[PDB]
Structures are given as structure tokens and as C-alpha cells.
Design an enzyme around this catalytic site. Structure first.
Site, PDB file in Angstrom:
ATOM      1  CD  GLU A 164      -3.112  -0.786   0.064  1.00 34.06           C
ATOM      2  OE1 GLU A 164      -3.162   0.331  -0.501  1.00 34.06           O
ATOM      3  OE2 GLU A 164      -3.882  -1.729  -0.230  1.00 34.06           O
TER       4      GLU A 164
ATOM      5  CG  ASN B 243      -8.366   7.066  -5.055  1.00 33.61           C
ATOM      6  OD1 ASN B 243      -7.503   6.344  -5.572  1.00 33.61           O
ATOM      7  ND2 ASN B 243      -8.621   7.045  -3.747  1.00 33.61           N
TER       8      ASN B 243
ATOM      9  CG  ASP C 259     -13.737   7.884  -5.235  1.00 32.82           C
ATOM     10  OD1 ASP C 259     -12.572   8.312  -5.203  1.00 32.82           O
ATOM     11  OD2 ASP C 259     -14.222   7.188  -4.325  1.00 32.82           O
TER      12      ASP C 259
ATOM     13  CB  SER D 205     -12.093   9.137  -1.971  1.00 36.60           C
ATOM     14  OG  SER D 205     -11.504   8.075  -2.708  1.00 36.60           O
TER      15      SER D 205
ATOM     16  CG  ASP E 225      -6.608   5.578  -1.154  1.00 36.55           C
ATOM     17  OD1 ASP E 225      -7.746   5.464  -0.670  1.00 36.55           O
ATOM     18  OD2 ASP E 225      -6.324   5.259  -2.324  1.00 36.55           O
TER      19      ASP E 225
ATOM     20  CG  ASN F 265     -11.221   5.953   0.230  1.00 36.14           C
ATOM     21  OD1 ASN F 265     -12.369   6.349   0.326  1.00 36.14           O
ATOM     22  ND2 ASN F 265     -10.466   6.189  -0.840  1.00 36.14           N
TER      23      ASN F 265
END
Length: 130
Positions: free
Chosen positions: A35, A46, A49, A51, A53, A60
Site C-alpha cells: 500500500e 483518486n 471519485d 477520495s 487514501d 480511504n
């Protein structure tokens, strides 16, 4: 901060991650590796959408933490996403524990399915004394 493999392994163990909700320490290590590369300040937007991380586990902002700019988001971990960018990973761990408490468990992270599931993950904790 960028953790060294074994240093992170021992840290996670102390924080009670070994066997949490049936998840072995080597699985959490495999997750952090893919990750963020064990980097607590990693962030990933992202565009698709809106959002982001955050942190070592790339949690998220749509469901877990609040950053204020994500649409229709909830804050299940009841934390500011900023908390997931600290060198001290205590809050990130408490939130990761919350994430896996849901039905999907560790499967909540697609990268885990791609690079960890059904694989020999022993290598992530070998020689670390955990």
C-alpha cells in the site's frame, strides 16, 4: 517516516495486530508493503471519485476518516485523515482494526487480494524476532 521492515513488524506486534480478527502479522506487513512501502506520509488522490487514501495502510477518506473535501463521506474511525499521516502509527492501527471489523475483513483492500492472498507471506516477518 519510512519504516524498516523488522522495525515495523515489532511495532505492529506491540500494538496487538498479530492475529487481530484472524489476521496474522505477516498479512498486515504484506498489506503495508504494497500500500505505501512502509511510508506513513503516503497520500493518494483518486481523481475518479474525489477520495484520498492516507498513510501507511492507505485508508480511504470516503468511509474511514474525515478530510472535509470528500463527497458523501463518513468518518467511521472518528478521526481527521491528518491523524493517519503521523510518524506515530497508533491512530492508523486503531483505524485499520476498525476497517477489518466489517465483514470483508482484510479483503477490504484490493491490493491485499492481488499481492498477498494465497501467497507465501512468511518473508515479510522473517528474522524480525516477532
Amino acid at each position: 517516516m519510512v519504516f524498516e521492515r523488522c522495525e515495523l513488524a515489532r511495532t505492529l506486534k506491540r500494538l496487538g495486530m498479530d492475529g487481530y480478527r484472524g489476521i496474522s502479522l505477516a498479512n498486515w506487513m504484506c498489506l503495508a508493503k504494497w500500500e505505501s512501502g512502509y511510508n506513513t506520509r503516503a497520500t493518494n488522490y483518486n481523481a475518479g471519485d474525489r477520495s484520498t487514501d492516507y498513510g501507511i495502510f492507505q485508508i480511504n477518506s470516503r468511509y474511514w476518516c474525515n478530510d472535509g473535501k470528500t463527497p458523501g463521506a463518513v468518518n467511521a474511525c472518528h478521526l481527521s485523515c491528518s491523524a493517519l499521516l503521523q510518524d506515530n502509527i497508533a491512530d492508523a492501527v486503531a483505524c485499520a482494526k476498525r476497517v477489518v471489523r466489517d465483514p470483508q475483513g482484510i479483503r477490504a483492500w484490493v491490493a491485499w487480494r492481488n499481492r498477498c492472498q494465497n501467497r507465501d507471506v512468511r518473508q515479510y516477518v522473517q528474522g524480525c524476532g516477532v
